[PDB]
């Protein structure tokens, strides 16, 4: 099925069988998202069930409550959990999202048409036809997903600034913090250029909520602009086409800029692993975004967990799928 | 939380992976060379 | 055909045009690259306590004049701004290198979009190119004007940074209340910069809009050529360099004594030069002296190169020179 390595039709590899089946692939992703959303809500409800008021969160071993309390959910002045009901509401809403995703996945795996190339010729569904070769098709997908991520980030920032704000570590309580919008100052962190001097952990030495909220505004605007870029153009440019790549497809650097299913998957996997490593640094050092009132002070274990996951995705998955895609570029 | 002993064990896994990888790579590469 | 030492003359060929373009991009990158690199080394060697006109800091005083870490005067409080500017320039360098390499070996060998494609004898093409570059230059001038309006640069008479009348038609006559090389008013600098930006943008609009006219095609006897165009550009550069060297030597409002040292005295032996008039230690010269003298002599040799390229552009060949001296033994 669009691959001939040695073992394409093995049951333990059977997911590759959906390489071209667009409808089934969409269903599979939706079901997976159902899993990813079931876990948080279920474990939040389980946590709130055993939560004790006198003891502090770091001493209760909660791995989802701290992230919710960091956003001012159910906490008051002094950083103590007051009311537990909003955590329960968050869990229930994740249950709802998971149920909707699972319904969609069941529809597209069984009721929906397996391959959208078999859609009835502009039936609201041919507009969703995509091919792992044509660039234009996948461009609009990237654009719309960027739209959603950007709207999420902007919503987070707007909530922080105007409505009910976040738990600011320095001010000791939940406040609508006034954002900092000095773009050079924000983008300096990416090279470690913190105001207090260069720092080893980029983006992680922020010492005030204003920096993070301004950065989120910047990221939201940037992602919205990129969404417009990809939705409105869909055409390959001399950046993607005609860029150097080293591969045994042709021994040595080439300017081909190849495209393939495994290659797209590999770039995505590498991106995820990189985010894992960046988050590792973040939770190791940045305690503005992780108030030790909630997550505790010692946080080497969580950072190491993130590190391992990031290495597995960036090195293992990224390399494996990149090599397979480059080899499949011998078609 | 990570302790020094656990970190040492993790570095052990790194070094052992490196050793095994270099040994296996040498063996397989040399076997492939004079096919 | 050209030898390797004269290898860049190969880019004169319209057969390989885009690669020629690449070179220019690379140059600018190198230029902005240096702007980063130099500053970094300067930021390493810059002591805060000492007067800023003793150690080899040229760019640091230029930033100091543009605000950037100065308070009540003689004040250095953050070397991070200098590093920020240097890093910005050096990062831009990578982008410009990327574009240079894209045109060098990835892009087309000859531009023949085609709208960018031009020929050495297409006066409308050069006219519109000239207009666009003038528009950008005037835009930079107006950007400097806006910086004056909002941020405001250091002033010695006020002793501090400060933000901000066109008698420029009298400065141009060098009337005794003038000789711009002795300007001492921030408002004068800002107004003149506004004027030059406006005039540059107007000229750019005009050149994009209107083709070269016959009346001015009469005088340009031979400049419609590679060597001619290069020569005229080099001559303009030399003129600008002379003016900048004189400004640096004489003017104190723009170049404050704090970061640049006192004014220079114009002296002449066999050739002109600028003396310190400062009781600096023997073997050391103020940054102002370095700037003025190196700028001036670079401009002088730019003038010589302008003569060389212009002569080659007209009907002259230098390789004939020994042969002449052969005949008249
Ligand atoms: C074991 C390797 C494996 C894993 C872990 C896995 N899949 Mg599949 N996988 C899908 C989703 C999926 C999701 C959402 C998901 C994890 O989130 C996984 N998968 C994971 C569906 C969209 C898609 C259709 C599934 C499909 O059609 O399912 C209906 C058919 C059957 C028999 C139901 C499966 C039930 C198990 C036998 C239960 C046995 C347990 C035991 C009693 C105790 C799919 C496939 C398929 C296969 C195969 C062989 C697999 N897989 C295999 C796997 C198709 O041919 C098949 C396929 O696409 O052929 C063209
Ligand atoms: C090597 C000098 C430098 C450059 C060329 C550079 N970074 Mg960094 N850089 C990032 C992005 C980035 C982008 C998009 C980018 C453009 O190509 C660069 N960088 C480039 C973030 C993902 C990341 C913040 C976490 C980052 C860092 C970080 C550092 C440091 C020291 C740097 N950098 C430095 C640089 C982190 O602390 C830190 C780090 O340890 O990660 C490598
Ligand atoms: C506005 C800034 C912007 C953002 C927010 C952004 N992109 Mg791009 N971006 C891509 C992915 C992408 C993802 C997955 C992603 C978010 O995760 C983003 N982008 C985000 C690749 C599909 C694509 C090739 C990148 C490549 O490999 O070259 C890309 C480009 C490209 C550009 C440009 C100008 C951008 N972008 C811009 C952005 C190509 O020319 C260029 C382009 O269109 O080449 C055809
Ligand atoms: C050694 C004398 C010399 C100098 C110092 C010099 N070039 Mg070259 N030089 C270029 C840029 C350049 C820049 C931006 C630059 C100054 O920063 C220089 N050069 C400088 C590229 C546009 C171009 C790269 C083409 C190419 O890759 O070959 C180039 C060449 C080339 C050569 C040769 C022989 C040279 N050169 C020579 C020089 C091409 O054939 C060759 C050439 O033009 O082929 C006809
Ligand atoms: C070759 C790279 C380079 C360029 C092109 C360059 N300088 Mg230097 N350069 C100076 C001026 C200068 C001017 C006016 C000028 C352009 O007009 C330049 N430079 C340009 C003097 C202020 C200063 C001493 C003059 C001197 O001897 O040079 C200087 C130096 C110095 C150096 C070094 C290594 C440089 N440079 C390097 C350069 C000192 O040690 C040294 C230094 O940092 O002093 C501590
Ligand atoms: C790093 C980005 C880069 C820079 C610095 C750059 N170009 Mg391009 N650039 C052009 C002019 C240009 C000028 C006059 C100029 C300097 O002012 C630059 N560029 C600069 C046009 C001749 C031409 C349109 C062009 C392109 C093109 C590309 C690409 C990829 C670039 N570029 C890239 C660059 C075409 O596809 C594309 C191309 O040539 O495809 C065949
Ligand atoms: C030192 C006097 C001088 C200056 C100011 C000068 N050139 Mg030359 N110069 C060039 C560009 C140039 C530019 C872009 C430029 C300004 O930025 C200058 N020059 C400036 C190249 C077009 C051309 C080849 C580059 C080259 O020879 O290197 C050149 C030459 C050459 C000469 C000579 C003698 C010069 N020059 C001299 C100068 C060639 O042999 C030589 C020549 O043409 O005869 C073989
Ligand atoms: C190939 C190109 C060749 C081009 C020409 C030759 C260039 C090489 C030689 C240049 C140096 C010449 C030094 C003369 C000094 C002299 O006469 O001093 C003595 C004279 C006179 O100095 C004093 O002047 C005072 C006047 O009131 C005094 O009262 C006395 O008259 C007199 O002693 O000095 C000058 O006039 C200064 C001239 C400075 C010229 C500098 C030119 C530099 C050109 C670049 C050289 C290479 C740099 C590389 C850097 C890396
Ligand atoms: C295309 C190409 C390739 C790939 C090259 C690579 C690896 C390219 C890498 C591209 C990357 C990593 C792009 C990512 C850029 C990251 C950006 C732009 C992050 C921006 C984040 C910002 C601005 C947030 C800032 C904040 C916001 C955040 C909320 C916190 O409050 C902190 C604070 C305030 C710093 C190869 C390898 C195939 C070949 C190469 O030659 C070219
Ligand atoms: C006519 C002729 C030719 C020669 C042509 C040439 C080379 C003519 C020369 C033209 C020159 C040298 C023009 C120069 C113009 C200079 C201008 C317009 C200066 C403008 C400066 C301004 C506006 C400064 C502004 C401020 C800026 C500064 C901040 C001051 O604090 C304040 C203030 C206001 C003075 C050829 C080549 C065609 C053929 C020849 O044979 C004959
Ligand atoms: C490129 C090329 C060539 C031509 C090459 C040539 C002719 C190149 C010409 C190079 C020159 C002459 C460059 C000139 C550089 C000028 C410099 C370096 C200026 C120096 C001034 C200094 C260092 C300051 C001196 C002070 C220092 C101190 C402040 C004093 O108080 C006063 C004062 C101002 C004099 C050939 C001939 C080799 C081959 C051709 O085919 C192509």
Automatic annotation (TrEMBL), chain A:
Transmembrane regions listed in the UniProt entry: 26-49, 61-79, 85-107, 138-158, 213-233, 263-283, 303-323
Domain of life of the native organism: Bacteria
GO MF annotation, one: chlorophyll binding
The keyword Transferase appears for this protein: no
UniProt-listed GO biological process terms: photosynthetic electron transport chain
UniProt topology in membrane: Multi-pass membrane protein
GO cellular component: a single term: plasma membrane-derived thylakoid membrane
UniProt-recorded name of the protein: High light inducible protein
Gene: hli
Pfam families with a match to the protein in the record: PSII (PF00421)
Record keywords, A-Z: Chlorophyll, Chromophore, Membrane, Photosynthesis, Thylakoid, Transmembrane, Transmembrane helix
Keyword Membrane among UniProt keywords: yes
Location relative to the cell: Cellular thylakoid membrane
From TrEMBL, chain C:
Name of this chain's protein: High light inducible protein
Membrane-spanning ranges: 20-37, 57-75, 81-102, 126-148, 194-216, 228-254, 289-308
Lineage of origin: Bacteria, Bacillati, Cyanobacteriota, Cyanophyceae, Acaryochloridales
SUPFAM superfamilies for this protein: Photosystem II antenna protein-like
Main location: membrane
Alphabetized InterPro entries for the sequence: PS_antenna-like, PS_II_antenna-like_sf
The organism's place on the tree of life at top rank: Bacteria
Localisation per UniProt entry: Cellular thylakoid membrane
Listed GO CC annotations: photosystem; plasma membrane-derived thylakoid membrane
Membrane topology designation: Multi-pass membrane protein
Pfam family, one: PSII
A biological process from GO: photosynthetic electron transport chain
Single GO MF descriptor: chlorophyll binding
Keywords, in A-Z order: Chlorophyll, Chromophore, Membrane, Photosynthesis, Thylakoid, Transmembrane, Transmembrane helix
């Amino acid at each position: 099925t669009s691959v001939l390595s040695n073992f394409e039709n093995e049951w333990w590899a059977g997911n590759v069988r959906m390489t071209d089946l667009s409808g089934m692939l969409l269903g599979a992703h939706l079901c997976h998202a159902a899993l990813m959303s079931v876990v948080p809500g279920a474990f939040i409800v389980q946590e709130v069930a055993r939560y004790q008021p006198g003891v502090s969160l770091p001493d209760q071993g909660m791995i989802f409550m701290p992230h919710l309390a960091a956003l001012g959910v159910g906490v008051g002045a002094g950083g103590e959990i007051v009311d537990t009901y909003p955590f329960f509401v968050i869990g229930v809403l994740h249950f709802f999202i998971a149920a909707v995703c699972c319904a969609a996945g069941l529809f597209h795996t069984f009721r929906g048409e397996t391959d959208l190339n078999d859609a009835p010729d502009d039936s609201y569904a041919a507009a969703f036809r995509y091919e792992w070769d044509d660039f234009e098709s996948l461009s609009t997908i990237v654009g719309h997903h960027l739209v959603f991520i950007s709207v999420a980030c902007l919503i987070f920032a707007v909530n922080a600034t105007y409505g009910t704000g976040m738990y600011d570590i320095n001010t000791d309580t939940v406040h609508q913090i006034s954002p900092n919008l000095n773009p050079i100052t924000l983008i300096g962190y990416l090279f470690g250029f913190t105001p207090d001097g260069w720092s080893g952990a980029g983006m992680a030495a922020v010492n005030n909520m204003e920096d993070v909220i301004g950065g989120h505004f910047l990221i939201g605007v940037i992602d919205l602009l990129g969404a417009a870029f990809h939705i409105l153009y869909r055409k390959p440019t001399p950046l993607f086409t005609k860029h150097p790549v080293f591969s045994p497809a042709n021994g040595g650097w080439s300017n081909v800029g190849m495209l393939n299913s495994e290659l797209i998957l590999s770039w995505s996997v590498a991106s995820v692993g990189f985010m894992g490593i960046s988050s590792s640094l973040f939770i190791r050092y940045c305690d503005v975004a992780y108030p030790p009132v909630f997550h505790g002070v010692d946080r080497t274990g969580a950072a190491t967990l993130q590190l391992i996951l990031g290495l597995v995705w960036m090195l293992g998955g990224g390399l494996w799928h990149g090599l397979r895609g480059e080899r499949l570029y011998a078609a | 939380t990570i302790t020094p002993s656990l970190q040492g064990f993790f570095y052990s896994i790194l070094f052992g992976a490196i050793v095994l990888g270099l040994l296996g790579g040498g063996f397989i590469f040399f076997s492939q060379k004079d096919k | 055909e050209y030898p390797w030492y004269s290898g860049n003359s190969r880019l004169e060929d319209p057969a390989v045009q885009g690669k020629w373009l690449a070179a220019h991009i690379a140059q600018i990158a190198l230029i902005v690259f240096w702007v980063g690199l130099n500053t970094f080394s300067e930021n390493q060697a810059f002591d805060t306590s000492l007067p800023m006109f003793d150690q080899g800091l040229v760019l640091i005083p230029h930033l100091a004049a543009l605000g950037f870490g100065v308070g009540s005067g003689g004040v250095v409080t953050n070397t991070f701004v200098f590093t920020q500017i240097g890093a910005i320039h050096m990062v831009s360098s990578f982008v410009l290198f990327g574009g240079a390499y894209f045109h060098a070996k990835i892009g087309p060998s000859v531009l023949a979009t085609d709208q960018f494609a031009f020929s050495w004898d297409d006066p409308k093409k050069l006219g519109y190119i000239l207009g666009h570059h003038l528009v950008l230059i005037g835009t930079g001038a107006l950007l400097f004007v806006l910086w004056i309006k909002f941020h405001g640069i250091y002033d010695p008479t006020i002793g501090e940074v400060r933000t901000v009348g066109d008698v420029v038609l009298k400065y141009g006559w060098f009337t005794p209340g003038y000789n711009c090389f002795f300007v001492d008013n921030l408002e004068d600098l800002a107004s003149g910069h506004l004027f030059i930006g406006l005039v540059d943008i107007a000229g750019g609009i005009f050149h994009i809009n209107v083709a070269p006219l016959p009346w001015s095609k009469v005088v340009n006897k031979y400049t419609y050529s590679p060597d001619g165009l290069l020569g005229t550009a080099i001559g303009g550069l030399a003129l600008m360099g002379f003016i900048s060297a004189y400004f640096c030597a004489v003017n104190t409002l723009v170049y404050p004594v704090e970061f640049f040292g006192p004014a220079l005295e114009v002296k002449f032996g066999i050739a002109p030069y600028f003396k310190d008039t400062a009781d600096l230690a023997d073997g050391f010269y103020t940054s102002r002296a370095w700037l003025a003298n190196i700028t001036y002599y670079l401009a002088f040799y730019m003038l010589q190169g302008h003569l060389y390229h212009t002569l080659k552009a007209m009907g002259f060949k230098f390789e004939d020179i020994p042969a002449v001296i052969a005949r008249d033994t």
